[PDB]
Symmetry: C4
DNA sequence: TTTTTTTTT
DNA sequence: TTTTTTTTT
DNA sequence: TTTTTTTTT
DNA sequence: TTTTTTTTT
């Protein structure tokens, strides 16, 4: 069965959620197993419609790859990164939706800003959710993501008993 | 069944103990599972009534959240933090008991001081337990807490087999 | 059964793959178990025959030992290392094939270069596969290898239940 | 059953071995479980009687506690520590055997020196085994010991399923 | 005994 | 296919 | 719902 | 064979 144990951070404008999506495996005819669809750390964003009350309907997703996770956890305090995703890459309708996730340190050094930009040329929409992440919150993420990385990679299958 | 494997540090005035409290889950009707009550790292303090002989009766608890754990493990040597808790928040009798946990580096750099303050306006009591933590002891905590963080978050449920 | 969950990095000239090989154990007559053949992190390299299309036939392997893994993960940004292996050491045909793996930081600091040299004096061949590894990619490796190290050592057998 | 998966380092004068000893638990009448005898990282030393040929008969043991492990893994490159143990503390024959383990960085910075001193006033013996540990070897230890620490503490018993 | 709360499947 | 070897239970 | 793809067993 | 001990459920 599925499991819902998100690490969620709520702030002024929007809320931020993070939970792993494990890899899918195919059992070969030879008996062994082969990783098929790679796992990710799924990031979800949604806005606040009212004093601490958020709109789950207007949520946007962003799937961190193994490498991108590696990038995030290796970030020094004075570091910043930006990831660009096309949800429908290699599909009939590519270049129509563009997603970009950005992590930038804030001036104070009291953590980072993490914002998701989603531009949809099909629906003519332009969404952006920014969420402030303290040092401690980003620390949970770094440690949690470090823990999950081997799993989303399927390396937890390698075990002596 | 339950499990009692505390990491305990004993010192002059008081003693310090730390062990995880796992999250509670509810099995949905849909089959999947959902994290309900979040896990914590439970901290217990108690005084010394006599030459190395402590009073377990006068113990006070403090429950570290995921974020607070993230804060503790991310602490540089020259860092200090303070957490404030109301045990009965959102309850009939709030603001009546106040707890504060403080981690401050000591002058020497030979670790930290960790003290729990508990002010009870109902019972008119004022308790404070301070415990010195060497670099090595705080190292156990940092590593142990890092290990436990994924578990108290319920991320150990995400596993390939 | 076996498991195939490689961490693969594809680049211009060649491709790089990494996955653990667990240790083999023998069950003693006394009942206990004893680690026999030590585990490794297996590295595979292969060339590119055409615009992003690689030759799996011309692959070369390199097996990182526990210690060598320890070396790799302890590398600062400004560090470089080189490992020399004779595949047929202590065998009839030693000194006939020589392998060397090198990790050097690139000028920019944007990661490392990792190249495998294989000199075969029996077949009169001289192969070399170089692959550029970004900071994020090497971060995956560092974290993945850290996770796997206890397992290839067989220390995952030590567990309370 | 027991498990033998030592991390061993062999050098000129002596050899060094390290493997965890898990904690013992007692099942309470209440149903739960309680950690009884604490786990350790067991260190074994033995001399070399001949060109790369060691004397397993003249081995000496040293049991690292949780805290001492915490100390070892927190060591910077320029750090050194010394631990003193009386094997028969709180026993009929205390003060008769004294053990001391020392970790000192070597001049070059190419790792550390680790030596075990055992003075026996009952048998009138004075033993000392020194073993050089490269940066990579000590890296294996740091990572392996970090992995094992939660287990020797019995914190691996805390798990969601 | 424990600072709660915010959104789904 | 893989750099081995050293000491026990 | 999710940026894909490249090579085996 | 191993530095112990301190307080509960």
């Amino acid at each position: 069965g599925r499991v819902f144990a998100p690490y969620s951070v709520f702030k002024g404008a929007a809320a931020l959620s993070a939970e792993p999506r494990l890899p899918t495996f195919n059992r070969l005819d030879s008996g062994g197993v082969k990783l098929n669809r790679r796992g990710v750390i799924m990031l979800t964003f949604w806005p606040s419609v009212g004093e601490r009350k958020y709109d789950w309907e207007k949520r946007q997703l962003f799937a961190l790859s193994a490498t991108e996770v590696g990038s995030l956890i290796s970030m020094g305090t004075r570091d910043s990164s930006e990831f660009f995703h096309d949800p429908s890459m290699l599909s009939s309708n590519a270049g129509q939706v563009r997603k970009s996730l950005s992590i930038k340190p804030n001036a104070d050094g009291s953590g980072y800003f993490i914002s998701l930009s989603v531009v949809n040329n099909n629906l003519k929409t332009n969404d952006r959710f920014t969420v402030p992440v303290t040092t401690a919150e980003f620390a949970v993420m770094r440690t949690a993501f470090s823990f999950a990385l081997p799993h989303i990679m399927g390396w937890d299958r390698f075990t002596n008993r």
